[PDB]
């Protein structure tokens, strides 16, 4: 079994701050798997920050940024989409359990 907790959330922030998360992730040999469904994921989330209050947590895999699939996308490009968005970001993530 793979228990999936999917959420799609909107982050809104001032310029004096970040969204409050570390994004990590990778080649071309990645094949999406229930255990590991995406390339980029959240390494940590600032508990006192914006991405935490919206429900993002350590270990969330990033599925969609601002409406676009980023399952197979590389770190620099995903970071770019996120940076284009400015002070708002719509992201879809999944948490995998068991």
């Amino acid at each position: 079994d793979y228990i999936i907790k999917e959420k799609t959330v909107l982050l809104q922030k001032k310029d004096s701050e970040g969204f409050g998360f570390v994004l990590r992730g990778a080649i071309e040999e990645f094949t999406p798997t229930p255990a590991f469904p995406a390339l980029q994921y959240l390494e940590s989330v600032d508990e006192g920050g914006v991405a935490w209050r919206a429900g993002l947590r350590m270990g969330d895999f990033l599925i969609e940024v601002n409406g676009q699939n980023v399952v197979k996308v590389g770190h620099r490009q995903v970071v770019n989409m996120i940076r284009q968005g400015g002070n708002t970001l719509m992201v879809k993530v999944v948490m995998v359990t068991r």
Binding site: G18, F19, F21, V22, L23, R24, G25, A26, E43, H75, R76, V79, I82, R83
Partner: peptide, 5 residues
């Protein structure tokens, strides 16, 4: 890679 956002 890693990036604080």
């Amino acid at each position: 890679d890693e990036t604080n956002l």
